[PDB]
Amino acid sequence: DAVEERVINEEYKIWKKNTPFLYDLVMTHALEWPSLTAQWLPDVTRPEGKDFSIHRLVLGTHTSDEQNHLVIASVQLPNDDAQFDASHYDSEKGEFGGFGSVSGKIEIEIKINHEGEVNRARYMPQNPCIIATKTPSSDVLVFDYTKHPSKPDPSGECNPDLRLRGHQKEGYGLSWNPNLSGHLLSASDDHTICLWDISAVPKEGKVVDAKTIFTGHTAVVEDVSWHLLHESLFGSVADDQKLMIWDTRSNNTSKPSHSVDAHTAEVNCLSFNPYSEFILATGSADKTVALWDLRNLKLKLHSFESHKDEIFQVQWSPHNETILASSGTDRRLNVWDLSKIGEEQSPEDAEDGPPELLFIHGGHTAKISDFSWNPNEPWVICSVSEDNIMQVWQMAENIYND
């Protein structure tokens, strides 16, 4: 279908022209290879007497034939004081271009040799130097990036600090317990969820077997996530259309504490609200994000509808309890605002979606694999797609601020 490909490119051209109206910040960067994963690291540095701050991303590569890498990248973001750079006028477009219109703001800092594509990479909250990765093989890997060179050996020899065993297939779900240092959950296409405790690894060993294996799902487990306050609770979602809440203290690992028929299709992602301890979201192939209360899982609270294809990722804002975002197979990324649920709309606005749909990011031209909210700069998002594009963006203030 060459016509749809032509339409997408023409629609991108319209979105690009519009950016100064809708964004305070928009950067588009072409990675050497596409990344399946994206997570902002928590640290930020503010060098002396300069107009920018430096933030960092955990990324990966997706090469079919070539050497893949675990990647750490730096991103410069402008301070509120900063001056406009007017040295890049363009007579064709009739514009100066904003912050990061040209190369200079994004850089690859570290590349660590990694066997196969990086399906997902997530840092350990208690020690951001530690990064777990999901590979196309069964072995979940842990890297302490300070124990590695910044520039890799060209042999491409993958030498992880730990190799975590338990699974029979690859997966995507990866979640560190923010209250129990070293406790990692993993989901897989083998229908299981594994749990490792790496806080007390003997003698500087290199392999670790799974402490527990949860076997409740009857299909591919797509995502897993710890509760953010309760160290024994965690959720999982799967192609069996189910949301499961698990208790690690329970003696039966084949049955969850609770099971819910959450969707009319595969459930691909979940995320706990970081402010409200009972709220969580799930995304699905039925094109909806569902909202849940842990204290009554029989009743779905709400359904966010508008997405034009399957949803694979969902994340809450780290700064605003009412704000979340979702992405998937369609090129658009949606930002929702639950406070605006039920607000009456004119028919003209209702054509574009329900009132709780705050923003549609149209900067990508291919399936979005992952995105991450910047924990230190409110409203900044990093999103990555299958065509190599990485965008760091921020919608215009007046969209969310009246």
Binding site: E11, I14, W15, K17, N18, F21, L22, R332, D349, D352, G353, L357, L358, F359, I360, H361, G362, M395, A396, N398, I399, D402
Partner: peptide, 20 residues
């Protein structure tokens, strides 16, 4: 720049050009 109605409208209509 634009009214609340128009800025919201542009926020949910990514692929339609913005005019004044």
């Amino acid at each position: 720049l634009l009214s609340s109605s128009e800025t919201k409208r542009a926020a949910r209509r990514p692929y339609k050009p913005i005019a004044l």
